[PDB]
Symmetry: C3
Subunit: 340 residues, 3 copies
């Protein structure tokens, strides 16, 4: 909500309290999403100041507070800053921002990251360019310097983040996206490549000095209908774990497909149908194996802009004999959301 | 404070900065409350949106930031989300919310949880139904569907929270409260029962498959006078530790009494007198032993709605030979509170 | 930004999102500031309520959220409450506040703590009176009870904070500051002395039962010019580490000098030149050694009150053979700041 707007500066202080519960069978160790309380809250601010008629400065910060921990020792589990960046936007020359932000390959993966609760499975955090990452310098142009309405592009510089863990690290890299929107249609293409750290190369799964990710996207977004498809491939970038062996690393290559179809009724209801499949190829010792593979059916009911409820159901197609130990059980999520 | 109210949505962003210091003798390892700096801050939001004339949606989130840690390694000690829930309220049919919220037995224990600093000793966090807990689904009715003014009830469903620690866990359970208010008087009754996890049953103190808690409450709240009494009993629910042995678990049964008498002067001062006693019975190897036992004398001075100061003094009656090692020294707390 | 002002209470909710990157050579283990992403965000509130015409109550809380951690296990690294206090201000009698606040010796060290990114090197956190500390009771008088315009003083009581670490602990102590301001000129003097804990005395570096810190300050602050000098000395208070040996403790004595010269152009640019040097003396086994020693050159460009960018460059004069292992490489910091 906009809580301040004076002298050229506007601040939006936003957040949500999500009462959320996952229903699966087991111990929930063989299901898609897990089981039990998943309640969380979000808090963030978004600021924008008009320096002059052509120049805008902006900043954004967003945090995740889990609401399913006790008030004991595990109290901070899962808490974290999601976004933290500041930038400048100038006329039709473009915008530049630096900090913790979305990788450029999410410019394409955002097309299908619209399910009520699940979906967006290949947009991993701290995984080069597909999700939220630290230390990215992003340059974005809209409408090709004001000359081609609807044609955008971006280039992103990713600085090395040598962390304690192979999973959360990355070396330097460069990525870019180009997209075109016209009358409800949109097409995007996005590609990133980066070096891998020593710690990443010491991992038993995956071999290579460079990580690459690319995705394509196609959508139709108008007349209360939302249809979108993504196709992407990664080399040495998708994090995987062999549960049997307890060995971890990156998939040599993945081939990813995500499809979503939703419809927004005027009275508030928004059904959703999706299909997601991600398969790893050439995994040392396993060969080809599915990482993700389901059908989704769900609905969101929007009481208004501040309140909603949803049910999200994953009809998991992972087989029980999946070679990496990837869970095969279904998951149903039910949620009540207040937001401002 | 209400910082936003537009288009049917109102957001209250609230908080406090509490400069707080406990005074006790020792090393403060044999006193009631401890000793030294206890400064903390609170931040929270409360939202409510009017969907239509009969239907309200709401959400609340509240966090505790300790202000007595260094900026080093111990910086997060004691920080945590206290509340995180969202719900819907419909006409006279009732309200339903889900998330981290107060257990239904706090519907009765809240009567005497009014001391300036201490008190509310049996309303433990993450302890089934007596305090703040995760994964509770709460249904509350006011005025018996609009037919009986002042008669309320609630039913609460508690989902299993299988945590790392016996102390912070719980199995499934159901609890309820009924209360009646009339012209300054109020009477409540509240009861909850839940399964205990394996980890809870593996503990050396306490034996049983089910945890039960109930409390009764009586109050008089009018004419600047506040008088309240609680009587409650628990089976297998109150967490205890034998400091000598360093063995921990739950008290087979407890018998709890809490009394409070306060008076609010018009000029700002609010003296308080209270008495609290909680005794465990049938503790393996100890027999009957006091957990809590004191007299309280205190005062709060309210400069206005935003500022106050208080002194809270605990005249501890625990004996020095208490068998579980429960501290016997007095504690004095002094506090300066700014809130919004 | 002031987001609430009604019925005598005003709340300022403030913050910033700082996209920040340090450039140094190495592994950055021999540079002044380190290397890589240093993005962070700040969130805080400042409240003030007018109780009556002579009496004001106030509270402040401020937190640091790092933006250069992954969303994994290291997510909280560096997060912490910086300030948390509440107080009362009465007419010309003075103000009193208690909580986590700046030590009184920062009353003098604040003179030169004005660099764009670095500087303020001897104002360590959780180090008795020179920086932010927990459990301080501060009394401050302005204009000598309203009788001497520009003459101020403060007295501060520091309570023992017996922490897990020698570095973040302190015993009881008392400190004070006196300062005088007149037509752009300001002179301050500040001194604090405290007991040291057992854990502090068990450390291999430094010998003594009491920690002392004092600093003097002189500034000229008017006509867009800012010039300031600090001179200070510490006994048993400055934390040091011998990287070779991996032994840690406090410097027996330090002699500290800090100089800053800045100029504010009307168009937004504010160049800065500074010099800082801190030398430890009588360090067990080393003799005299430099802790800090550089020249700074930098600039901040202020687009307006909400947006700025800066470059801060440290021309390090530490030699490569420095006996404690103190880094000798330069550091360049570049920052884009949105604030509200």
């Amino acid at each position: 909500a906009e809580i301040y707007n004076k002298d050229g500066n506007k601040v939006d202080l936003y957040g949500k309290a999500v009462g959320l519960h996952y229903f699966s069978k087991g111990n929930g160790e063989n299901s898609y999403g897990g089981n039990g309380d998943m309640t969380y809250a979000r808090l963030g601010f978004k600021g924008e100041t008009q320096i002059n008629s052509d120049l805008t400065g902006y900043g954004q910060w967003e945090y995740n507070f889990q609401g399913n921990n006790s008030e004991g020792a595990d109290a901070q589990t899962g808490n974290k800053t999601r976004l933290a960046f500041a930038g400048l936007k100038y006329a039709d020359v473009g915008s530049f921002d630096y900090g913790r932000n979305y990788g450029v390959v999410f410019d394409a993966l955002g097309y299908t990251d619209m399910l009520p609760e699940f979906g967006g499975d290949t947009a991993y955090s701290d995984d080069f360019f597909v999700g939220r990452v630290g230390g990215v310098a992003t340059y974005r142009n809209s409408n090709f310097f004001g000359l081609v309405d609807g044609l955008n592009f971006a280039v992103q510089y990713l600085g090395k983040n040598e962390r304690d863990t192979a999973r959360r690290s990355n070396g330097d890299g460069v990525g870019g996206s180009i997209s075109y929107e016209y009358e409800g249609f949109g097409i995007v293409g996005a590609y990133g490549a980066a070096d891998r750290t020593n710690l990443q190369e010491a991992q038993p799964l995956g071999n290579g000095k460079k990580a690459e990710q690319w995705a394509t996207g196609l959508k139709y977004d108008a007349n209360n209908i939302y249809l979108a498809a993504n196709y992407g491939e990664t080399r040495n970038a998708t994090p995987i774990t062999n549960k049997f062996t307890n060995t971890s690393g990156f998939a040599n290559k993945t081939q990813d497909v995500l499809l979503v179809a939703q419809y927004q009724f005027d009275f508030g209801l928004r059904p959703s149908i999706a299909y997601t499949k991600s398969k790893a190829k050439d995994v040392e010792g396993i060969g080809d194996v599915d990482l993700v593979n389901y059908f989704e059916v769900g609905a969101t009911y929007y009481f208004n802009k501040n309140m909603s409820t949803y049910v999200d159901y994953i009809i998991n197609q992972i087989d029980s004999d999946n070679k990496l130990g990837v869970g095969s059980d279904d998951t149903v999520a039910v949620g009540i959301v207040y937001q401002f």
